[PDB]
Short mmCIF file of N, CA and C in Angstrom, two decimals:
data_model
loop_
_atom_site.label_atom_id
_atom_site.label_comp_id
_atom_site.label_asym_id
_atom_site.label_seq_id
_atom_site.Cartn_x
_atom_site.Cartn_y
_atom_site.Cartn_z
N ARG M 1 -46.39 29.52 2.34
CA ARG M 1 -45.63 28.08 2.28
C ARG M 1 -45.03 26.70 1.79
N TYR M 2 -44.91 26.54 0.66
CA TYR M 2 -44.96 25.36 0.23
C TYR M 2 -43.70 24.79 -0.32
N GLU M 3 -42.98 24.20 0.05
CA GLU M 3 -41.79 23.09 -0.25
C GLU M 3 -41.64 22.30 -1.65
N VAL M 4 -40.38 22.20 -2.58
CA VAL M 4 -40.46 22.62 -3.72
C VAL M 4 -38.56 21.86 -3.79
N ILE M 5 -38.53 20.61 -4.34
CA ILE M 5 -37.57 20.15 -4.51
C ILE M 5 -37.30 21.00 -6.07
N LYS M 6 -35.75 21.24 -6.86
CA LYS M 6 -34.88 21.57 -7.32
C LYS M 6 -33.66 21.20 -7.58
N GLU M 7 -32.71 22.04 -8.53
CA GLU M 7 -31.81 20.96 -9.38
C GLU M 7 -30.74 21.78 -7.83
N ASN M 8 -30.88 22.97 -6.82
CA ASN M 8 -30.57 23.01 -5.77
C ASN M 8 -30.28 22.56 -4.73
N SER M 9 -31.37 21.16 -4.76
CA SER M 9 -31.52 20.61 -3.42
C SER M 9 -31.11 19.52 -3.64
N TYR M 10 -30.89 18.37 -2.39
CA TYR M 10 -30.79 16.94 -2.02
C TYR M 10 -31.66 16.12 -1.83
N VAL M 11 -31.24 14.75 -2.51
CA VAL M 11 -31.89 13.63 -1.48
C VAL M 11 -31.42 13.04 -0.87
N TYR M 12 -31.80 12.78 0.07
CA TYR M 12 -30.90 11.35 1.17
C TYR M 12 -31.43 10.62 1.30
N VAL M 13 -31.34 9.71 1.31
CA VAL M 13 -31.57 8.26 1.19
C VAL M 13 -30.73 6.56 2.30
N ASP M 14 -30.89 6.86 4.41
CA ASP M 14 -30.14 6.00 4.46
C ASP M 14 -31.32 5.02 3.96
N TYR M 15 -29.66 3.57 4.32
CA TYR M 15 -29.80 2.50 3.70
C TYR M 15 -29.11 1.45 4.91
N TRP M 16 -29.83 0.39 5.32
CA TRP M 16 -29.43 -0.14 5.70
C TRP M 16 -29.65 -1.72 5.32
N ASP M 17 -29.36 -2.82 6.25
CA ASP M 17 -29.66 -4.07 5.41
C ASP M 17 -28.90 -5.25 5.82
N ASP M 18 -29.68 -6.43 6.23
CA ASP M 18 -29.26 -7.76 7.56
C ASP M 18 -28.16 -8.55 6.70
N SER M 19 -27.35 -8.46 6.00
CA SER M 19 -26.32 -8.86 5.01
C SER M 19 -25.48 -9.55 5.46
N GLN M 20 -25.32 -10.88 5.50
CA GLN M 20 -23.39 -11.28 6.21
C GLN M 20 -22.29 -9.70 5.63
N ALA M 21 -22.95 -9.58 4.29
CA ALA M 21 -21.43 -8.77 4.36
C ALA M 21 -21.08 -7.28 4.48
N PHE M 22 -23.11 -7.22 4.94
CA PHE M 22 -22.86 -5.61 5.59
C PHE M 22 -22.17 -5.42 7.08
N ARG M 23 -22.26 -6.94 7.78
CA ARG M 23 -21.38 -6.98 8.66
C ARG M 23 -20.31 -6.98 8.69
N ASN M 24 -20.07 -6.69 7.67
CA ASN M 24 -18.67 -7.14 6.97
C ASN M 24 -17.93 -5.42 6.29
N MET M 25 -18.60 -3.96 5.84
CA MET M 25 -18.39 -2.65 5.87
C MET M 25 -18.29 -2.08 6.91
N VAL M 26 -16.76 -2.29 7.71
CA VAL M 26 -16.17 -1.63 8.70
C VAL M 26 -15.10 -0.88 8.99
N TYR M 27 -14.49 -1.96 8.44
CA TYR M 27 -12.75 -0.80 8.04
C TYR M 27 -12.94 -0.82 6.26
N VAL M 28 -13.52 0.66 6.13
CA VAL M 28 -13.29 0.52 4.69
C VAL M 28 -12.32 1.22 4.44
N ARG M 29 -11.41 1.28 3.01
CA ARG M 29 -10.70 1.84 2.69
C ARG M 29 -10.94 2.06 0.96
N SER M 30 -12.54 1.95 0.34
CA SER M 30 -12.89 2.09 -0.14
C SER M 30 -14.58 1.88 -1.09
N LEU M 31 -14.65 2.67 -1.53
CA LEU M 31 -16.13 1.92 -2.23
C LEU M 31 -16.50 2.61 -3.63
N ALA M 32 -17.29 2.15 -4.37
CA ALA M 32 -17.77 2.69 -5.87
C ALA M 32 -18.80 1.73 -6.07
N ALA M 33 -19.46 2.89 -6.85
CA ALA M 33 -21.13 2.51 -7.34
C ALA M 33 -21.14 3.08 -8.73
N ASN M 34 -22.01 1.87 -9.29
CA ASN M 34 -22.69 2.20 -10.98
C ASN M 34 -24.75 1.96 -10.54
N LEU M 35 -24.41 3.66 -10.21
CA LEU M 35 -26.25 3.28 -9.42
C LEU M 35 -27.09 4.08 -10.70
N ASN M 36 -28.28 3.73 -10.95
CA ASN M 36 -29.49 3.84 -12.11
C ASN M 36 -29.71 5.31 -11.43
N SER M 37 -30.88 5.71 -12.83
CA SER M 37 -31.61 7.22 -12.24
C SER M 37 -32.69 6.69 -11.69
N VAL M 38 -33.77 7.46 -10.97
CA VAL M 38 -35.04 7.30 -10.68
C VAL M 38 -36.00 8.79 -11.42
N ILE M 39 -37.21 9.09 -11.51
CA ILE M 39 -37.38 10.05 -12.06
C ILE M 39 -38.81 9.96 -10.94
N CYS M 40 -39.01 10.85 -9.62
CA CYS M 40 -39.95 11.32 -8.91
C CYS M 40 -40.48 12.38 -9.50
N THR M 41 -41.80 11.59 -9.77
CA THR M 41 -43.18 12.72 -10.10
C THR M 41 -43.83 13.02 -9.14
N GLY M 42 -44.94 13.96 -9.58
CA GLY M 42 -45.57 14.31 -7.92
C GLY M 42 -47.59 14.43 -8.67
N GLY M 43 -48.03 14.04 -7.46
CA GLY M 43 -49.28 13.66 -7.68
C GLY M 43 -50.43 14.52 -7.53
N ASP M 44 -51.31 14.99 -8.12
CA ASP M 44 -52.16 15.51 -7.60
C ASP M 44 -52.50 15.93 -5.58
N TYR M 45 -53.00 16.52 -5.98
CA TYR M 45 -53.77 17.58 -4.62
C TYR M 45 -54.25 17.97 -4.29
N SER M 46 -55.93 18.26 -4.08
CA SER M 46 -56.82 18.83 -3.69
C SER M 46 -57.15 20.02 -2.77
N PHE M 47 -56.75 21.34 -2.91
CA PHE M 47 -57.08 22.36 -2.00
C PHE M 47 -59.11 22.30 -1.45
N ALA M 48 -59.19 22.17 -1.27
CA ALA M 48 -60.51 22.19 -0.63
C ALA M 48 -61.49 23.24 -0.14
N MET Q 1 60.63 -27.81 9.44
CA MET Q 1 59.51 -27.79 10.07
C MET Q 1 59.08 -26.41 10.40
N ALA Q 2 59.68 -25.76 11.10
CA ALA Q 2 59.18 -23.87 11.62
C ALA Q 2 60.28 -23.69 9.96
N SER Q 3 61.30 -24.78 9.89
CA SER Q 3 61.82 -23.83 8.59
C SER Q 3 60.81 -23.82 7.18
N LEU Q 4 59.60 -24.07 7.39
CA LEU Q 4 58.38 -24.16 5.95
C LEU Q 4 58.04 -22.98 7.07
N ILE Q 5 57.07 -23.37 7.09
CA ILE Q 5 56.42 -22.75 8.23
C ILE Q 5 56.33 -21.15 8.45
N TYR Q 6 57.62 -20.94 8.68
CA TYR Q 6 58.49 -19.82 8.74
C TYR Q 6 58.94 -19.26 7.17
N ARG Q 7 59.39 -19.55 6.79
CA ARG Q 7 60.19 -19.79 4.90
C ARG Q 7 58.86 -19.61 4.04
N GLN Q 8 58.30 -20.40 4.43
CA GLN Q 8 56.48 -21.14 3.82
C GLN Q 8 56.17 -19.11 3.41
N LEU Q 9 55.92 -18.52 4.45
CA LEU Q 9 55.06 -17.85 4.34
C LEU Q 9 55.76 -16.46 3.47
N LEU Q 10 57.19 -15.53 3.90
CA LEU Q 10 57.76 -15.18 2.90
C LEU Q 10 57.47 -15.05 2.01
N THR Q 11 57.61 -16.06 1.32
CA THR Q 11 57.40 -17.07 -0.01
C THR Q 11 56.21 -16.05 -0.11
N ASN Q 12 55.25 -17.46 0.02
CA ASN Q 12 53.61 -16.72 -0.57
C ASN Q 12 53.35 -15.53 0.14
N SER Q 13 54.02 -14.16 -0.39
CA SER Q 13 54.14 -12.77 0.23
C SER Q 13 52.86 -12.28 -1.22
N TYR Q 14 53.49 -12.78 -2.15
CA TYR Q 14 53.36 -12.14 -3.07
C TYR Q 14 51.94 -12.04 -3.64
N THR Q 15 50.97 -12.59 -2.86
CA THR Q 15 49.65 -12.89 -3.10
C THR Q 15 48.47 -12.47 -2.03
N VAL Q 16 49.79 -11.41 -1.00
CA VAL Q 16 49.59 -10.30 -0.15
C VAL Q 16 48.41 -9.14 -1.12
N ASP Q 17 48.69 -9.11 -1.79
CA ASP Q 17 49.06 -8.38 -3.29
C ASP Q 17 46.98 -8.81 -3.75
N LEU Q 18 47.43 -9.47 -4.66
CA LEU Q 18 46.27 -10.19 -5.21
C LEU Q 18 44.96 -10.05 -4.53
N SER Q 19 45.32 -10.53 -3.30
CA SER Q 19 43.26 -9.77 -2.53
C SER Q 19 43.62 -8.98 -1.90
N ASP Q 20 44.97 -8.69 -1.13
CA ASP Q 20 44.31 -7.42 -0.89
C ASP Q 20 43.57 -6.22 -2.19
N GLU Q 21 44.28 -6.02 -3.45
CA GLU Q 21 43.40 -5.20 -4.04
C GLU Q 21 42.39 -6.30 -4.47
N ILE Q 22 41.52 -7.03 -3.84
CA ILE Q 22 40.53 -7.19 -4.00
C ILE Q 22 39.42 -6.84 -3.72
N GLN Q 23 38.94 -6.99 -1.70
CA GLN Q 23 38.82 -5.99 -0.93
C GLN Q 23 38.37 -4.33 -1.03
N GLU Q 24 39.33 -4.29 -2.02
CA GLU Q 24 39.42 -2.46 -2.44
C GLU Q 24 38.83 -2.74 -3.60
N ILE Q 25 39.59 -2.71 -4.61
CA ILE Q 25 37.94 -2.98 -6.21
C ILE Q 25 37.18 -3.77 -6.48
N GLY Q 26 37.27 -4.52 -5.13
CA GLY Q 26 35.87 -5.43 -5.13
C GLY Q 26 34.76 -4.81 -4.74
N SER Q 27 34.77 -4.21 -3.45
CA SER Q 27 34.47 -3.09 -2.83
C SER Q 27 34.31 -1.66 -3.57
N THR Q 28 34.80 -1.57 -4.56
CA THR Q 28 35.41 -0.45 -5.10
C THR Q 28 34.41 -0.59 -6.74
N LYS Q 29 34.05 -1.81 -6.90
CA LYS Q 29 33.28 -2.59 -7.61
C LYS Q 29 31.35 -2.34 -6.94
N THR Q 30 31.37 -3.30 -6.59
CA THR Q 30 30.67 -3.51 -5.56
C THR Q 30 28.65 -4.20 -6.87
N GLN Q 31 27.98 -5.19 -6.40
CA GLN Q 31 26.60 -5.17 -6.78
C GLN Q 31 25.72 -4.30 -6.29
N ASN Q 32 24.78 -4.09 -6.42
CA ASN Q 32 23.25 -3.41 -5.28
C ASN Q 32 22.48 -5.15 -5.11
N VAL Q 33 23.05 -5.22 -3.86
CA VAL Q 33 21.58 -6.46 -3.15
C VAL Q 33 20.63 -5.57 -2.50
N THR Q 34 19.93 -6.74 -2.23
CA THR Q 34 18.42 -6.65 -2.16
C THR Q 34 17.61 -6.87 -0.59
N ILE Q 35 16.63 -6.10 -0.17
CA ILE Q 35 15.79 -6.34 0.50
C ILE Q 35 14.69 -7.23 0.60
N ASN Q 36 14.02 -8.08 1.31
CA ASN Q 36 13.47 -8.93 1.23
C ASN Q 36 12.43 -9.50 2.58
N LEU Q 37 11.38 -8.24 1.95
CA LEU Q 37 10.16 -7.45 2.53
C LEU Q 37 9.13 -7.22 1.70
N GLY Q 38 8.31 -7.83 2.75
CA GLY Q 38 7.12 -8.14 2.06
C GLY Q 38 6.26 -8.92 2.53
N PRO Q 39 6.62 -9.27 3.54
CA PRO Q 39 5.69 -10.28 4.50
C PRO Q 39 4.29 -10.64 3.85
N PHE Q 40 4.15 -8.65 4.37
CA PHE Q 40 2.77 -8.64 4.89
C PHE Q 40 2.51 -7.47 3.89
N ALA Q 41 1.54 -7.44 3.88
CA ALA Q 41 0.28 -5.67 3.62
C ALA Q 41 1.72 -4.44 4.34
N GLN Q 42 1.54 -3.27 3.92
CA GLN Q 42 2.24 -2.03 3.92
C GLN Q 42 1.32 -1.72 4.85
N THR Q 43 -0.16 -1.54 4.15
CA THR Q 43 -1.10 -1.47 3.82
C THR Q 43 -1.74 -0.30 5.49
N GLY Q 44 -2.54 0.98 4.76
CA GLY Q 44 -3.11 2.15 5.78
C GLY Q 44 -3.87 2.03 5.01
N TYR Q 45 -4.75 3.51 5.21
CA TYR Q 45 -5.89 4.30 5.03
C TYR Q 45 -5.60 5.38 3.78
N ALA Q 46 -6.02 5.67 3.10
CA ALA Q 46 -5.27 6.38 1.97
C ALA Q 46 -5.98 7.47 1.69
N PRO Q 47 -6.58 8.60 2.34
CA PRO Q 47 -6.91 9.92 1.72
C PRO Q 47 -7.07 10.72 3.12
N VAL Q 48 -7.07 11.61 2.77
CA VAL Q 48 -7.33 12.81 4.19
C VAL Q 48 -7.97 13.80 3.69
N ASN Q 49 -9.04 13.89 4.44
CA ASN Q 49 -10.42 14.62 3.81
C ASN Q 49 -11.04 15.21 5.71
#
């Protein structure tokens, strides 16, 4: 069994930071973002 | 003295009408008056889910 992520899969990234603003995002009315895409590419793996 | 006051009245009754006619038409006509609220934000949460 080997796992493969494809178009029916999701990647989740949990994020926390120590910035003063972040201490501020508690009672939120709305959030919006303009985020870049990134390509994740597999490296080699040898089976000895 | 009283002579006036008394008579003075019945003399100025014709007025009763004009005035009388105001509070009717006046009220029969009327302007739309404003609500001064908005001291602070109405603000609430804005989506159910």
